[PDB]
Ligand binder design. Structure first.
Ligand SMILES: CC(C)=CCC/C(C)=C\CC/C(C)=C\CC/C(C)=C/CC/C(C)=C/CC/C(C)=C/CC/C(C)=C\CC/C(C)=C\CC/C(C)=C\CC1=C(C)C(=O)c2ccccc2C1=O
Ligand code: HDD
Ligand code: HEB
Ligand code: HEB
Lengths: 337, 455
């Protein structure tokens, strides 16, 4: 019914916001190591400093929304995909403590461990989430009883591995244009240097994964979404060679990330956990959803707090909209080891 | 061990690690807001340094508090898929509603408070820490109400058409008597953890300074001790509200804190009991203090009858079928002495610190400095023991049947577990334990480095 279909887009929007906001957060994390090849690492980290916690909650809200709206969907994907999600949590945990504790102790060995935690919390989520969403679009061996009995080839195949590399490459390009917009000076120039190198290889991964999803699982209306992604990617590709705009460059890359979420969720409709053995046993938005009263009660709460959440989250980015340079970085106030 | 036992330990060890930093975060956030508010009103630079000093320690605890809660959000679907489906229509609403009403606020405004000292106005920056101080309490309420549905399910029907419990009224679920009693008790428990933490650190510096900084840590010692004493009074009142609820909702758990075996009128509360407490028949009681269990069960010292564990064992078999409804007697018994006994150290420390700081006096005793250090872990361990008794006391019920509610709305831990293998859960349990253990050591070391360093 209506509420069942409406909440499918609300969960997709929560994952949409997670990919838009945490997408460049992951890109910053995997671009700190090539920046050195200390001041540049801190400048890039401070771009996502006051927003990394808020950005992350979108994944937490999306995960809890699924639990409340579609209890069967929550208890199937997170149960079947136990191993890929285990490494996602492992990285996230390290990044949640490495960002805050990096500047607590002034010691090169202390920061080396903190950089690993940030890298672990930015590489694994960038790679595995693309695989996790590719698995859902491809499907899972769900039987009539609801069990999955996941196997190795059902996770690491040609389609899922391409999706993981595409999202990780897109996030790296997403973080490259985000730093170039939030920084100025030599650090901004280095962001465009990697953006050019991450322009063509990433575009092929996104186009290849997008075309594969469209030709195998996409619908008729999803062709426009792929066309927008292609146009956005081509616009974003040419906006980095010549740095005419930072915002346009970031906005065009934002559309590419947004179009991937719509394309993945557009193909994952109305099925939530497609069954590769029998499509009748697949989990849909009708046989795995909650009652209308629960979806109704959650609708009023979502319609009040989700628009309110974007109100101050956007204002939070407006407060720290000023670009930060190497001269604006405060001296390291870390204790001796 | 089997899959169920390994999954029980994993959901236990990780979330116990989570409740090491949560009670400090809940109580300390209003405390720093108080110090920052006093700095704005009184224009006292002493309160500004207290805000920067204890605020620094809060951020170290806040970062690891977020990390330890990430797994718990998806842990329900990973290791308790069967349990997630049964109560997803009811249990998922408090978890999701806390995401947009408390998690989005306390995570977005915490960044504004850290990086907005010189960018945001003083009035606006002050409200940022107050929103975080409120959102942590809001998050505690919804996450406790969801757990209170397990302890006392209300506003839900079985709906035998499908094998899951379905929500009937959201108001009844949020206004549960167990939810309100446990929320106010945990918040009072969190205030004691932070109140003792502020008082102990400030009192530790008073002796160190004597052996202005003294001017600065003395007001914090007074504020921390009175908050701990106020939290102790709240813990007694809310603890008296909770025991009564426990009596009529979970008779097994009420007798679990006593290891009661037969239905006796006005039982004696035993401080100590020897043995592993397997069978319970041979238990030995030491220092039996009367007028305690009657007062906690029905609120009256005399005339209260409590059903024994043995008596309740056969009673539950006649309604829920043949099963082992006996919780872990050894764990629940000693985890209950622990929650209660661990009041003396914090309360004892608060009383002494206030006596040594009367009339502007600055303490300088060496034993007082050592007393504060040993007082710091007492509320942290007491909070851990309080929730452990709540979770091990309801075994083997993951969803305790409501005596006055729907009988069919219930589930066991074994029937709520997922269908993983013994090696997959063990690998996750092993990697969860070491990663949290390393971070816990770093978290403890980071606090020690900044406490001795000071401003
Ligand atoms: C005046 C005074 C001293 C009063 C208190 C002393 C007193 C009266 C009694 C306590 C002393 C005695 C004899 C026994 C202890 C009672 C007892 C067993 C209490 C419960 C244990 C408890 C609360 C432990 C606190 C843990 C804690 C905060 C440790 C420090 C923090 C750190 C760094 C690590 C701890 C996390 C860790 C590695 C393991 C956590 C394990 C714990 C505590 C709970 C989890 C857990 C337990 C305990 C099970 O028994 C169990 C059984 C079946 C399935 C699952 C589980 C399960 O998950
Ligand atoms: C009574 C308090 C309390 C209890 C019983 C719990 N939590 Fe918690 N949780 C907190 C109180 C809290 C908090 C105090 O509000 C924290 C700690 C620091 C923080 O940022 O929020 C937190 C953080 C926190 C976060 C980080 C969100 C963010 O800020 O980015 C998540 C995802 C969870 N929790 C989830 C859970 C789940 C799924 C629980 C049950 C299994 C749980 N918590 C038990
Ligand atoms: C969300 C809601 C919730 C919550 C809040 C919580 C909160 C908590 N918790 Fe919990 N749990 C749960 C839900 C929950 N929970 C469950 C469901 C389970 C399953 C059942 C069993 O296993 O028992 C558990 C289980 C559990 C355990 C194990 C036990 C056994 O098994 O025997 C433990 C130890 C714990 C602790 C804890 C704590 C400490 C806390 C504080 C933080 N836990
Ligand atoms: C701060 C620390 C602490 C403390 C001190 C305390 C102190 C106390 N306490 Fe407590 N708890 C706690 C922490 C605590 N606590 C907790 C955490 C818990 C869990 C949650 C709830 O509320 O439930 C409890 C819970 C609880 C309860 C309920 C149980 C169930 O339900 O399961 C009761 C009855 C009580 C009583 C009491 C008392 C009487 C006292 C006096 C001694 N406790």
């Amino acid at each position: 019914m209506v509420l069942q279909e409406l909440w499918f887009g609300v969960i997709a929007a929560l994952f949409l916001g997670f990919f838009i906001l945490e997408g460049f957060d992951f890109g910053v994390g995997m671009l700190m190591a090539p920046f050195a090849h200390e001041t540049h690492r801190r400048t890039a980290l401070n771009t996502i400093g006051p927003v990394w916690d808020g950005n992350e909650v979108w994944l937490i809200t999306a995960g809890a929304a699924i639990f409340a709206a579609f209890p069967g969907w929550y208890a199937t994907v997170f149960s079947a995909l136990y191993l890929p999600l285990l490494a996602i949590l492992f990285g996230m945990i390290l990044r949640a403590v490495a960002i805050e504790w990096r500047g607590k102790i002034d010691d090169p060995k202390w920061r080396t461990g903190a950089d690993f935690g940030i890298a672990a919390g930015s590489w694994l989520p960038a790679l595995l989430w693309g695989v996790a969403f590719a698995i859902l679009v491809r499907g899972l061996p769900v039987d009539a009883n609801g069990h999955v009995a996941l196997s190795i080839p059902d996770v690491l195949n040609a389609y899922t591995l391409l999706g993981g590399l595409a999202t990780a490459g897109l996030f790296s390009l997403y973080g490259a244009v985000f730093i170039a917009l939030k920084t100025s000076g030599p650090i901004r120039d280095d962001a465009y240097r990697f953006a050019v190198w991450l322009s063509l290889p990433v575009a092929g991964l996104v186009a290849g994964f997008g075309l594969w999803t469209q030709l195998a699982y996409g619908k008729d209306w999803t062709w426009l979404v792929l066309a927008v992604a292609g146009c956005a990617q081509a616009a974003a590709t040419v906006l980095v060679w010549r740095r005419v705009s930072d915002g346009w460059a970031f906005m065009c890359t934002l559309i590419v990330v947004a179009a991937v979420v719509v394309l993945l969720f557009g193909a994952l409709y109305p099925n939530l956990v497609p069954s590769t053995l029998n499509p009748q046993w697949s989990l849909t938005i009708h046989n795995a959803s909650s009652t209308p009263y629960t979806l109704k009660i959650m609708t009023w709460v979502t319609a009040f707090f989700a628009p309110l959440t974007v109100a101050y989250q956007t204002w939070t980015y407006w407060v720290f909209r000023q670009r930060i340079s190497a001269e604006r970085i405060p001296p390291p106030t870390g204790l001796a080891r | 061990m089997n899959v169920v036992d390994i999954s029980r330990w994993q959901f236990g060890i990780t979330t116990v690690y989570h409740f090491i930093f949560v009670p400090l975060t809940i109580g300390l956030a209003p405390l720093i807001a108080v110090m920052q508010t006093l700095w704005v009103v009184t224009d006292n630079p002493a309160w500004y340094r207290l805000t920067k000093f204890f605020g620094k320690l809060f951020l170290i605890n806040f970062a690891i508090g977020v990390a330890t809660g990430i797994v718990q959000e998806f842990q329900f679907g990973m290791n308790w898929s069967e349990y997630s489906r049964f109560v997803g229509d009811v249990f998922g609403a408090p978890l999701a509603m806390e995401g947009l009403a408390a998690f989005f606020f306390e995570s977005t405004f915490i960044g504004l408070w850290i990086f907005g000292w010189n960018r945001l106005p003083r009035l606006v920056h002050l409200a940022c820490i107050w929103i975080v101080a409120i959102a942590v309490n809001v998050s505690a309420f919804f996450i406790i109400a969801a757990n209170s549905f397990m302890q006392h399910p209300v506003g839900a029907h079985y709906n035998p058409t499908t094998g899951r419990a379905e929500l009937s009224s959201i108001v009844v679920l949020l206004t549960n008597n167990t939810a309100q009693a446990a929320f106010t008790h945990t918040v009072s428990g969190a205030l004691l953890t932070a109140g003792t933490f502020v008082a102990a650190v400030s009192a530790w510096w008073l002796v160190r300074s004597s052996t202005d900084t003294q001017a600065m840590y003395r007001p914090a010692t007074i504020l921390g001790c009175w908050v701990a004493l106020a939290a102790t009074a709240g813990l007694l009142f809310t603890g008296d509200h909770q025991g009564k609820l426990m009596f009529q909702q979970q008779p097994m758990k009420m007798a679990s804190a006593e290891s009661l075996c037969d239905t006796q009128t006005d039982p004696n509360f035993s401080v100590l009991t020897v043995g592993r407490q397997n069978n319970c028949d041979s238990l030995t009681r030491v220092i039996e203090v009367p007028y305690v269990l009657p007062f906690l069960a029905e609120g009256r010292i005399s005339g209260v009858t409590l059903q024994g564990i043995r008596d309740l064992q056969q009673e539950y078999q006649q309604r829920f079928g043949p099963n082992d409804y006996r919780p872990n007697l050894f764990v629940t018994y000693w985890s209950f002495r622990m929650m209660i006994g661990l009041m003396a150290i914090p309360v004892l420390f608060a009383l002494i610190a206030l006596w040594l700081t009367r009339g502007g006096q600055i303490p300088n005793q060496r034993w007082f400095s050592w007393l504060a250090l040993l007082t710091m872990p007492a509320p942290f361990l007491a909070n851990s023991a309080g929730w452990v008794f709540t979770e091990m006391g309801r075994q083997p019920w993951v969803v305790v049947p409501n005596p006055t509610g729907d009988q069919l709305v219930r589930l066991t831990v074994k029937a709520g577990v997922s269908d993983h293998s013994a090696t997959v859960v063990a690998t996750s349990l092993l990697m969860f334990t070491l990663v949290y253990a390393v971070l816990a050591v770093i978290w403890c070391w980071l606090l020690k480095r900044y406490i001795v360093e000071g401003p």
